Amino acid sequence: FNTDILATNLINLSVVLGVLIFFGKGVLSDLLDNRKQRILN
């Protein structure tokens, strides 16, 4: 119910979510874009 503040729970999660969003938008846009190009073809 109340929020619990501490800088231990999430610093590990920010690095992970950043790495996943960057390398995931890279390989995901590459794959998705490739599929779109094939459909256009």
Next chain:
Amino acid sequence: LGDFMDKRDASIKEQLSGVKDTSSEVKQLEEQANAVMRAARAEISAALNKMKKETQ
């Protein structure tokens, strides 16, 4: 979003089919034109021959 994905894919697939459809239609048009041209020529030739033979 699922519907949007489907719509875009269908729109593209439909475009390909239509493009495939148009190509077949043009092939048929060309074949029909070729066949028709042949008829004209051949037809007239035959006519003259039969007519030429009758005159002779």
